[PDB]
Amino acid sequence: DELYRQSLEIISRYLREQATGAKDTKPMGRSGATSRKALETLRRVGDGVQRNHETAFQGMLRKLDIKNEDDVKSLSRVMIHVFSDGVTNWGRIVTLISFGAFVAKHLKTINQESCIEPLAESITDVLVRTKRDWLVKQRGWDGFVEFFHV
Ligand SMILES: COCCn1c(C(=O)O)cc2cc(C)cc(N3C[C@@H](C)n4c(c(CCCOc5cc(C)c(Cl)c(C)c5)c5ccc(Cl)c(-c6c(C)nn(C)c6C)c54)C3=O)c21
């Protein structure tokens, strides 16, 4: 319903902005405040996650050997495997998206900007499908911004 659309808007905006390598502060949609604040939080926490896990991110990127949109279509399986284990929390969700931004920068490097939208959708699809009930219990992105945004 609303949860998918809002998630996709947040994730797509962050991956896109990360790939161009400058912030975009165009406002969001109707639920403008929450989505804006979630995006600001992703910039802060997400950028730190990428720095912290530079090595593992780099090693994993290399093993994924991404070239084109067909590869992008084939990322979902490893993504699901690595994320749908065990504990759910917002830090883990930021880690999933942060790895998404890391790949999106690579896609830019190899002139595969067309793939960034499919990537974001694939991330959103996995997030909302596997964690729907938990996300609803937290009041979704409101729960994220309420407690994590500074
Ligand atoms: C130890 O953690 C087990 C899993 N886990 C549990 C739990 O209970 O299982 C709780 C918990 C809490 C947090 C905050 C984080 C983790 N992690 C820590 C590690 C295991 N991770 C996690 C993620 C996020 C989920 C997948 O995102 C993806 C996103 C995209 C766009 C693609 Cl295309 C793909 C293929 C994957 C990682 C992403 C990349 C790497 Cl490179 C590592 C990564 C790092 C870093 N080091 N190494 C060796 C790898 C392989 C990742 C994760 O969710 C947690």
Numbering used by the authors: 172 to 321
Which sentences did the original study use to describe this structure?
The B cell lymphoma 2 (Bcl-2) family of proteins are key regulators of intrinsic apoptosis. The antiapoptotic protein myeloid cell leukemia 1 (Mcl-1), which is associated with high tumor grade, poor survival, and resistance to treatment, has emerged as a promising candidate for treating hematological and solid cancers. The binding interaction is driven by the four hydrophobic residues (L210, L213, V216, and V220 in Mcl-1) in the conserved BH3 domain which bind to four corresponding hydrophobic pockets (P1-4) on the antiapoptotic members. ,− To achieve potent cellular efficacy, Mcl-1 inhibitors require exceptionally low binding affinities (subnanomolar).
Two copies of compound 8 bound to Mcl-1 were present in the asymmetric unit, with unambiguous electron density maps of the ligand molecules suggesting two different binding poses of compound 8. The superimposed structures of these two ligand binding poses show a different orientation of the indole 2-carboxylic acid moiety while the other parts of compound 8 remains the same. Figure B,B1 show the favored binding pose, which represents the conformation adopted by the indole 2-carboxylic acid moiety of the ligand in the majority of the cocrystal structures we have obtained in the program. This binding pose provides optimal overlap between the Arg263 residue and the indole ring resulting a cation–π interaction. Additionally, the 2-carboxylic acid moiety forms a polar interaction with the Asn260 side chain. However, as we occasionally observed in our X-ray cocrystals, the ligand may also adopt a binding pose where the indole 2-carboxylic acid is rotated 180° around the C–N amide bond (C1).
